[PDB]
């Protein structure tokens, strides 16, 4: 009943130990930039346990602002395998028989002329800027772009960052292009601003061409011309339902599976970077009275300025075990909620007839256009043109944040240094450039501007990790087996 | 403490049912051949 069938040797015994790795890094950057603050290689079978402590010091404020700044911190796992196609060939998986003959080395990225600049992605990955002639393995720059494409990109208004999977070397860049230069280590990627009424608009009422019923143009009084069947009508209605479902939920394959079939599919199955953990917190603002006397052409005694000092604790930022070669990347970005001073709410335009007004019967109609007059009103023909599309009657579910009086930016003597509200020189278009966070609105509230090349933020990050790794406790020379 | 951040519509409601599918196939082949005897889309 039993015969000898080969089986596993169980292999060698792998050592294991726990290691405490502290790490501290000091950074300076502006609002809206997605900044890598940590990276580590992870070998198969490691359990990583990570705590983060952060101390944020924004530039001092002219006055205490009537607005908030919010920090988001993110942790991700990127397998080397989804970044580089030759990973398996590298460890010896062969298409042919026996051993692999020529396995390409891990690809290199080469510094720009004069090296990378200050504030680039290479700078915050820990590549030393302004050092020409240096080259470095590129898989972590690829890993950064992969995380943007899987998570941070808006798939409706922009294309994805360029990501090369091949074994060829690449040329580093100092450029600010948000598509091509991300994997090249250039300026960081700028986060999109939070979902609100205007940031949630879409290019069309459906994702696709609008569905119509057919019209033939034939003439011999016109004979024939046929018509439309109830069956062709049912098809058209389902096509419109399909494209509208794609517009609401997103068309990524992880998103397709949830909206169409109601199914959660794992990120690792789909070759997406894995989300580990994250935290979100606003920053504290401490106001300082003026105790010096009033001087002519100066601020008076009792004036209030502000500073901002905030200590954020992230425990269990990463807790998990890893089954394959991967990188951990930790990201940080500072954003604020938006307020709008140049538009007029859509309800001020209703009342042409009774069908402009909300009714329960018109509850399930198609997505309706958001007019340009709502985001910026110019008093010209562009007011009634379309900015974007929102669900029907959404302005009755939303009241965008606003500013009135001397507080608004266009006033000749303006108090706008009290708040972060948007200001537009021209009519904004729904697009990739408008959807990005803007550091200039925060910048007019600061005593020392970033336009003067003062970084808006100075942060101290302290990392404490407990790593259970497949290494010996101490690595002491000399071998157990010969 | 709470503000309006967009979220999922939960989508439509998807129907679901159980189906018994019988299938019978008759084959002839030799020893050693790896023969597909069934396939289905899922």
């Amino acid at each position: 009943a039993r015969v000898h069938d080969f089986s596993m040797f169980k292999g060698n015994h792998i050592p294991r130990s726990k290691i405490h790795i502290p790490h501290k890094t000091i950074r300076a950057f502006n609002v809206g930039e997605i900044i890598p603050i940590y990276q580590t290689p992870v070998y198969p079978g490691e359990h990583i346990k990570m705590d983060l402590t952060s101390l944020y010091r924004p530039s001092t404020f002219i006055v205490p602002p009537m607005d908030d700044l919010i920090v988001d911190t993110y942790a991700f796992a990127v397998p080397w395998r989804i970044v580089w196609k030759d990973l398996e060939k590298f460890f010896g998986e062969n298409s042919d028989s026996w051993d692999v003959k020529n396995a390409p080395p891990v690809p290199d990225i080469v510094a720009p002329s004069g090296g990378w600049d200050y504030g680039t992605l290479a700078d915050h990955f820990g590549i030393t800027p302004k050092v020409p002639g240096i080259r470095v393995k590129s898989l972590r720059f690829r890993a950064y772009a992969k995380i943007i494409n899987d998570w941070f990109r808006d798939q409706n208004l922009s294309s994805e960052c360029a990501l090369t999977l091949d074994s060829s070397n690449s040329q580093g860049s100092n450029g600010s292009n948000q598509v091509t230069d991300i994997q090249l280590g250039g300026k960081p990627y700028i986060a999109n601003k939070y979902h609100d009424y205007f940031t949630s608009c879409l290019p069309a009422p459906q994702k696709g061409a609008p569905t119509t019923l057919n019209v033939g143009g034939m003439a011999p009084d016109l004979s024939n011309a046929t018509g439309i069947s109830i069956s062709d009508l049912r098809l058209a209605i389902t096509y419109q339902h399909y494209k509208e479902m794609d517009a609401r939920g997103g068309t990524r394959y992880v998103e397709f599976t949830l909206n169409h079939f109601g199914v959660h599919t794992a990120d690792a199955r789909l070759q997406r970077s894995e989300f580990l953990g994250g935290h979100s917190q606003s920053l504290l603002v401490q106001s300082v009275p003026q105790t010096s006397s009033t001087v002519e052409k100066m601020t008076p005694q009792g004036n209030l300025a502000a500073f901002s000092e905030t200590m954020i604790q992230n425990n269990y930022l990463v807790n998990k075990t890893f089954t394959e070669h991967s990188y951990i990347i930790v990201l940080a970005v500072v954003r604020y909620k938006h307020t709008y001073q140049q538009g007029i709410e859509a309800d001020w335009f209703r009342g042409q007839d009774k069908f402009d007004m909300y009714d329960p019967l018109l509850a399930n109609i198609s997505e309706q256009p958001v007019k340009n007059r709502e985001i910026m009103v110019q008093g010209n023909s562009q007011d009634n043109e379309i900015f974007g599309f929102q669900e029907a009657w959404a302005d009755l579910r939303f009241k965008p944040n606003s500013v009135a009086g001397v507080m608004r930016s266009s006033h000749p003597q303006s108090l706008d240094y009290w708040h972060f509200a948007d200001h537009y020189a021209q009519l904004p278009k729904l697009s990739s450039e408008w959807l990005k966070e803007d550091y200039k609105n925060v910048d007019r509230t600061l005593a020392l501007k970033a336009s003067d090349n003062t970084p808006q933020l100075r942060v101290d990050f302290m990392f404490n990790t407990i790593a259970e790794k497949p290494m010996p406790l101490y690595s002491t020379p000399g071998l157990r087996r010969i | 403490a709470r503000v309006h951040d967009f979220s999922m519509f939960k989508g439509n409601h998807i129907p679901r049912s159980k189906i018994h599918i019988p299938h019978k196939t008759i084959r002839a082949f030799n020893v050693g051949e790896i023969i597909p005897i069934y396939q289905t889309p899922v």
């Binding site: 908030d68 993110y74 808006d154 879409l202 990524r252 992880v254 603002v285 669900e391 | 979220s7």
Partner: peptide
């Protein structure tokens, strides 16, 4: 009830939160 810190700058308060993957309108973006 009346006296409070040097910490008041706005009417609106923001609560700290754990971040979770979500599917808002138009696909995932953080």
């Amino acid at each position: 009830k009346r006296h409070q810190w040097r910490l008041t700058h706005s009417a609106r308060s923001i609560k700290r939160a754990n971040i979770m993957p979500s599917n808002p309108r138009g696909g995932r973006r953080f």
